Amino acid sequence: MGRLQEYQVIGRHLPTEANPNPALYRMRIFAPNEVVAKSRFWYFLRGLKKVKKATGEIVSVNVISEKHPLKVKNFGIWLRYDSRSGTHNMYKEYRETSRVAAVEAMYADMAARHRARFRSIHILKVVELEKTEDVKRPYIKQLVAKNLSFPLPHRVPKISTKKIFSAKRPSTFS
Template sequence: MASAMLPVEHVFGAVAEGQCWLLGMSRFTEYSVVGRTLPTEADPAPKLYRMRIFAPNEVVAKSRYWYYLRQLKKAKKANGEIVALNIIHEKKPLKVKNFAIWLRYDSRSGTHNMVKEFRALSRAEAVESMYQDMAARHRARFRNVQILRVAEIEKTEDIRRPYIKQLITPGLKFPLPHRRTKSKAWYAANRPSTWA
């Protein structure tokens, strides 16, 4: 039976932007969402409000936008509109960077502020790691975590967390604990082929 390589679409389904974490892409995409309240006679040209939202797709990005705008300004989806929704791509997606994420989350006992540091290729990957970390350490769900700010740490002196500091030491080496020598094949399973 001839084994043929299947296209990725056959294995994982249609791969959309920022939706296939099995292929090494991030589950989250960074969106720039711009919206406003609907124009009225009292306010014919309402202010535009722009936010950077990390979400798995556009529908969730719009939903989170209205969630935050409803808290910050007197605006909601019923009397507002989305003007623009764009994906923000990473400028250098192959460079490993250190990120600091300021967040607020609701636990069983109250609301807490926190700063976490992550090492990732993009802001979206750092945010995904943050959500995984918050779920593991604090049992915080996606709906309970509010991202306040995501910033790249430019200088290595500004890194505060020891689990990130240990990865930036010069000449870092990792042990290879379970190396197995490959046994030499004394006998060939097939006859030698001299025909070229």
């Protein structure tokens, strides 16, 4: 859902006389910016603990960048989405180069295939498949095969949309 960045958001309850050192809660949140990241932090924290924004504070917001954005990786995402019936689990896999790109591909795929919006999807886990034996979806298993080489038949050539007329009928073989 947009150019997403992963943030660690650490927050806590406001210190009182009973608890001078309240517990810190850290979450990894995919959001377009820090305001949305803090909003999602307060939402997920209201879903789990007796802390809201008026009674708590944000200790830290940091950006978690990808360690190796130049390495092709397989990601398994376990998610829960809310439909007309209720909340359902989905396990999906994406062959991307970063967790953020995997999450954008996830959001586009769920919007395309199940009409699920950003407001109705909970990202529960995003993990890296260390071995290719952990890959379970056949559309990624056909990509992790040995000596994968394929042609590209029927490639429509890119002709400028401002050039209306051409004197040669284009070919679709390059």
